[PDB]
Design an enzyme around this catalytic site. Structure first.
Site, PDB file in Angstrom:
ATOM      1  N   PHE A 151      -9.213   3.986   3.930  1.00  0.00           N
ATOM      2  CA  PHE A 151      -8.852   3.295   5.016  1.00  0.00           C
ATOM      3  C   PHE A 151      -9.897   2.360   5.377  1.00  0.00           C
ATOM      4  CE2 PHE A 151      -5.692   6.685   5.022  1.00  0.00           C
ATOM      5  CZ  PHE A 151      -4.404   6.028   4.728  1.00  0.00           C
ATOM      6  N   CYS A 189      -8.535   0.561   8.419  1.00  0.00           N
ATOM      7  CA  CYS A 189      -6.918   0.101   8.356  1.00  0.00           C
ATOM      8  C   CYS A 189      -6.272   0.562   9.548  1.00  0.00           C
ATOM      9  CB  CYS A 189      -6.201   0.865   7.079  1.00  0.00           C
ATOM     10  SG  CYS A 189      -4.728   0.477   6.961  1.00  0.00           S
ATOM     11  N   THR A 241       0.827  -1.318  -0.051  1.00  0.00           N
ATOM     12  CA  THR A 241      -0.063   0.077  -0.177  1.00  0.00           C
ATOM     13  C   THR A 241       0.737   1.199   0.073  1.00  0.00           C
ATOM     14  OG1 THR A 241      -0.161  -0.119   2.353  1.00  0.00           O
ATOM     15  CG2 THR A 241      -1.960  -1.018   1.219  1.00  0.00           C
TER      16      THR A 241
HETATM   17  C1  FDE Z   1       0.626  -2.184   8.311  1.00  0.00           C
HETATM   18  C2  FDE Z   1      -0.416  -1.567   7.365  1.00  0.00           C
HETATM   19  C3  FDE Z   1      -0.039  -0.689   6.684  1.00  0.00           C
HETATM   20  C4  FDE Z   1      -1.415  -0.131   6.112  1.00  0.00           C
HETATM   21  C5  FDE Z   1      -1.511   0.646   4.950  1.00  0.00           C
HETATM   22  C6  FDE Z   1      -2.712   1.082   3.994  1.00  0.00           C
HETATM   23  C7  FDE Z   1      -2.952   1.980   3.223  1.00  0.00           C
HETATM   24  C8  FDE Z   1      -1.717   2.868   2.613  1.00  0.00           C
HETATM   25  C9  FDE Z   1      -4.193   1.994   2.389  1.00  0.00           C
HETATM   26  C10 FDE Z   1      -4.702   0.932   3.358  1.00  0.00           C
HETATM   27  C11 FDE Z   1      -5.826   0.400   3.405  1.00  0.00           C
HETATM   28  C12 FDE Z   1      -6.707  -0.588   4.041  1.00  0.00           C
HETATM   29  N1  FDE Z   1      -6.225  -1.162   5.076  1.00  0.00           N
HETATM   30 FE1  FDE Z   1      -4.354  -1.286   5.747  1.00  0.00          FE
HETATM   31  N2  FDE Z   1      -2.275  -0.996   6.275  1.00  0.00           N
HETATM   32  C13 FDE Z   1      -1.753  -1.832   7.256  1.00  0.00           C
HETATM   33  C14 FDE Z   1      -2.525  -2.661   7.610  1.00  0.00           C
HETATM   34  C15 FDE Z   1      -3.893  -3.347   7.925  1.00  0.00           C
HETATM   35  C16 FDE Z   1      -4.307  -4.307   8.682  1.00  0.00           C
HETATM   36  C17 FDE Z   1      -3.498  -5.352   9.434  1.00  0.00           C
HETATM   37  C18 FDE Z   1      -5.703  -4.178   8.204  1.00  0.00           C
HETATM   38  C19 FDE Z   1      -6.688  -5.037   8.905  1.00  0.00           C
HETATM   39  C20 FDE Z   1      -7.123  -4.628   9.923  1.00  0.00           C
HETATM   40  C21 FDE Z   1      -8.430  -5.197  10.200  1.00  0.00           C
HETATM   41  O1  FDE Z   1      -9.378  -4.612   9.665  1.00  0.00           O
HETATM   42  O2  FDE Z   1      -8.621  -5.888  10.923  1.00  0.00           O
HETATM   43  C22 FDE Z   1      -5.802  -3.377   7.366  1.00  0.00           C
HETATM   44  C23 FDE Z   1      -7.045  -3.016   6.578  1.00  0.00           C
HETATM   45  C24 FDE Z   1      -7.315  -2.033   5.629  1.00  0.00           C
HETATM   46  C25 FDE Z   1      -8.409  -1.716   4.903  1.00  0.00           C
HETATM   47  C26 FDE Z   1      -9.803  -2.622   5.166  1.00  0.00           C
HETATM   48  C27 FDE Z   1      -9.563  -3.896   4.756  1.00  0.00           C
HETATM   49  C28 FDE Z   1     -11.072  -4.426   4.243  1.00  0.00           C
HETATM   50  O3  FDE Z   1     -11.347  -5.424   3.702  1.00  0.00           O
HETATM   51  O4  FDE Z   1     -12.030  -3.610   5.033  1.00  0.00           O
HETATM   52  C29 FDE Z   1      -8.173  -0.762   3.613  1.00  0.00           C
HETATM   53  C30 FDE Z   1      -9.149  -0.163   2.691  1.00  0.00           C
HETATM   54  N3  FDE Z   1      -4.690  -2.575   7.058  1.00  0.00           N
HETATM   55  N4  FDE Z   1      -3.733   0.431   4.388  1.00  0.00           N
END
Ligand code: FDE
Ligand code: FDE
EC number: 1.14.14.1
Lengths: 455, 115, 452
Positions: free
Chosen positions: C390, C397, C265
């Site tokens: 996210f 995230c 990512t």
């Molecule tokens: C170490 C690290 C770094 C990072 C970065 C990043 C960037 C530049 C953009 C992003 C995104 C994301 N993530 Fe990220 N990331 C991480 C991680 C992670 C983990 C362990 C998970 C699973 C937690 C829970 O939800 O259980 C994620 C998670 C994540 C998400 C949600 C998946 C589903 O199937 O719902 C998204 C849309 N991430 N991301």
């Protein structure tokens, strides 16, 4: 006097279940048993049971007139692929006593003498493999013991060759089988067996049972075709129960075949594996057994008689099975209303769980030096208190294969000591894999060949 | 030579009735084990394996590549880049492994390697 | 019910599966959304799913009381080497909430201060590599971002040094990961996974999982040889309901999870930003301006990284247009109706096309395709659930702060030290694994001759 039982931390409608949401429940129920003492109530959603840890209470529970073998939730789940076979049948169901009586001849001493030949065959293969290793190679012990036991039960019981030593990857049958046992274990802890995370598990579970049934049906085909055969299997087919006259229906045969394969291969692998661990960690004990080996096994291959000589080897094996009984628990239910140990009233049908590991750690019976590995506790076995050492279950429902197993480990364990020196080259920290049975995980050694030839 | 030959006889002896023998594979298991023992006193244990050895597979893939280069009208075309990358990966596998055979001796027997 | 949902062209028993027989599946789903609108049904041989693209429907689908995170077919395949890791676990699975609560400390703003130093270590290595280039050469941008992001997660997270900058053909682990990730995507298109043609593929994949478990499972032992890092939190942290630390195999799943998700990512994220900078030179100017003004020490301070406001805005505006993890999936917790128009059975699946959400014209205005970072000058003006790069909810995230810090830090240092030329006039080309990175993106950089 009529005192209420301790119960650990309880959650909402799911009761005590989260306490046992590990990959090592028995090790967890131990660390709970150590916390709550000899007895505690453990409720799960819709089921209630009592876990016992003191010999005092166990002596009461081993009265076969008051308690009868109960199918734990665990066993109810293995019954999903072992059905009403000997391990997972109610002692009052028709097929239990029928099968118990037709098969019992096949495990007394008199029958053992017949198996001894093929047992040596499989053992020579293991030793042959360890001889044929290159210098810096290692031994994965639980994996090689698995090869051994499955090859041993399948040949003695069924005259079928898995030829596990001719493989690197486990026999696929073992892969499915282990995942089936693992699934029964995991289904115990499922906080919601509904919601979709468990749909592939349903898939896998049935797919793995099919795998087991196929090779079972191949063993049955292999015999309908291939012989002077004194078997577990011939007694299963041709054998007739002397009380009602009939032989086993095919379905129950299939459940018996699977039953025998599983129980032998799982408990007996764990046993030998543990045995090596404690030996390699206590080298004077290894020394003491390592000379009983050299002293008794004076012919190139062991004879049935020589196996009964190996007294200390039996003592080693006993002390190992004491510490970690690979079948760590069996379950009982109250035949009628009673009071257990004078303190706890129970309605008829209440279920009991014997935590065999925790019984085998009772200080009033075994002393204050329990967790130390000293095979000398098992030298006057008559000195051992009644109902204190129950690795093979209890009563008429005790393990029918106990002597076969004791004979198996001692022979195999004996030859290992005769032919090799063993190095704990990794300083392995003990890691107990838990399906429903127990066994050490990732255990590795190096073996120095004593360069003694075989027959 | 006899040692490897008994393993084959024992393996075929130990087969069940419904099973058969895959002939080239078991001959390959045999021949390789025999030279590794007679020549260099190294035990491949081919009869203790179901999937072939990493060395044998590299050797087999390398030979196939050598053959495969015969029909390539221009070996520079990018179409063959993975074929090239694996070729070297297998040359390392064999060349590394052979030195594993060398480690066992300087780190003593009337054999091919000693000469 | 009121509204029958659109569905694109169908190929008999193969359903609309051939529609993603590109190397650019996500981009194809966009092309379909652009013509069919805010929702459309997408059917495959064994599954059916609905793709959402309007902020209107997404706001409903992000209701955590009606919908939970679903494992799309894609994530189901990553579950074969990432197993039970946070990304590929079900919410009600036993290791999710377990691992989730122990790890949240390792990504809190408080944790960043500790990662900052090793974050810089790898960040200078990158700067030094660029400083040491001769003039005729160029920079292969995704490759160097992959080198950086992987070395940073490996160093800052687990105190393991991949040393990517000391090698030219990529690390075996990273080459294995990318090939394992490629196999997951490649399956999506196989209506016959049992067919023998896939034996070499099934073989190689199985060999690639062994490669990952090899290094990673060695690292868990190699530390038992304890400092204050992500791995220590995993080895030492305790769950309050069973009191146990994480499974040994579960940790192997998290490390694999963290290595991939971060390196895939964040590297894609940085690359996209740089594209937009060299293509929008005035934005490049103002961004290097703040960079020159704030980055006043031979080395950046944690406080200073926070004091970049425009670099962060370019980052937000970059991830808006091309969110490197383009989609997440949901399932109906119970029967319900979506947008008052589309009824849903319990268990029905939803897919959020984040790029298409991020182009919803009614929300961002009619210049949705223009790279205009000043949309982020007032972040509170942006509607709840209009910008979900996210993910959403508790399944959001976990590393978004770690990521933003790394991208902000690195992007800041790049702007301080070099001027960048789109010397080839690179046309944007999106590589699709499951994640999105640009391909063949190259620049030349003239050093501003400044020491570290
Ligand atoms: C170490 C690290 C770094 C990072 C970065 C990043 C960037 C530049 C953009 C992003 C995104 C994301 N993530 Fe990220 N990331 C991480 C991680 C992670 C983990 C362990 C998970 C699973 C937690 C829970 O939800 O259980 C994620 C998670 C994540 C998400 C949600 C998946 C589903 O199937 O719902 C998204 C849309 N991430 N991301
Ligand atoms: C073959 C074989 C082998 C063996 C081994 C063994 C070892 C090492 C250990 C053991 C154990 C045991 N077991 Fe055992 N084993 C066997 C078996 C068995 C059977 C069949 C059973 C059931 C029985 C009756 O009675 O039915 C058992 C059984 C047994 C028991 C109990 C169970 C209940 O639930 O009660 C126990 C505890 N086992 N084990």
């Amino acid at each position: 006097t009529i005192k209420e039982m301790p119960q650990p931390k309880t959650f909402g409608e799911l009761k005590n279940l989260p306490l046992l949401n590990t990959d090592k429940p028995v090790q967890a129920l131990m660390k709970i048993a150590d916390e709550l003492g000899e007895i505690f109530k453990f409720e799960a959603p819709g089921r209630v049971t009592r876990y016992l840890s003191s010999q005092r209470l166990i002596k009461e529970a081993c009265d076969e007139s008051r308690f009868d073998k109960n199918l734990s939730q665990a066993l109810k789940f293995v019954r999903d692929f072992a059905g009403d076979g000997l391990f997972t049948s109610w002692t009052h169901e028709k097929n239990w006593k029928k099968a118990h009586n037709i098969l019992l001849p096949s495990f007394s001493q008199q029958a053992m003498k017949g198996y001894h030949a093929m047992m040596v065959d499989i053992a020579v293969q293991l030793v042959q493999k360890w001889e044929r290793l290159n210098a810096d190679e290692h031994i994965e012990v639980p994996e090689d013991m698995t090869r051994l036991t499955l090859d041993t039960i399948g040949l003695c019981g069924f005259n079928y060759r898995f030829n596990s030593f001719y493989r690197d990857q486990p026999h696929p049958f073992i892969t499915s089988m282990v995942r089936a046992l693992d699934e029964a274990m995991n289904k115990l802890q499922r906080a919601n067996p509904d919601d979709p995370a468990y749909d592939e598990n349903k898939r896998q579970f049935q797919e793995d049972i099919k795998v087991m049934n196929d090779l079972v049906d191949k063993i049955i085909a292999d015999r309908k075709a291939s012989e002077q055969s004194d078997d577990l299997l011939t007694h299963m087919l041709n054998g007739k129960d002397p009380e009602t006259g009939e032989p086993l229906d095919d379905e129950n045969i299939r459940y018996q075949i699977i039953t025998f394969l599983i129980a032998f291969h799982e408990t007996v692998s764990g046993w030998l594996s543990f045995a090596l661990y404690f030996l390699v960690k206590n080298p004077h004990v290894l020394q003491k057994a390592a000379e009983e080996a050299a002293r008794v096994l004076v012919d190139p291959v062991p004879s049935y008689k020589q196996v009964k000589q190996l007294k200390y080897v039996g003592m080693v094996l006993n002390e190992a099975i004491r510490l970690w009984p690979t079948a760590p628990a069996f379950s009982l239910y109250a035949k009628e209303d009673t009071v257990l140990g004078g303190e706890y009233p129970l309605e008829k049908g209440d279920e009991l769980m014997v935590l065999i590991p925790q019984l085998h750690r009772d200080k009033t019976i075994w002393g204050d030096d329990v967790e130390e590995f000293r095979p000398e506790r098992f030298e006057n076995p008559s000195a051992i208190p009644q109902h204190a050492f129950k690795p093979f279950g209890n009563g008429q429902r005790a393990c029918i294969g106990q002597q076969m197993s004791l004979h198996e480990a001692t022979l195999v364990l004996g030859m290992m000591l005769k032919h090799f020196d063993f190095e704990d080259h990794t300083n392995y920290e003990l890691d107990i894999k838990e399906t429903l049975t127990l066994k050490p995980e990732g255990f590795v050694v190096k073996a120095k060949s004593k360069k003694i030839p075989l027959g």
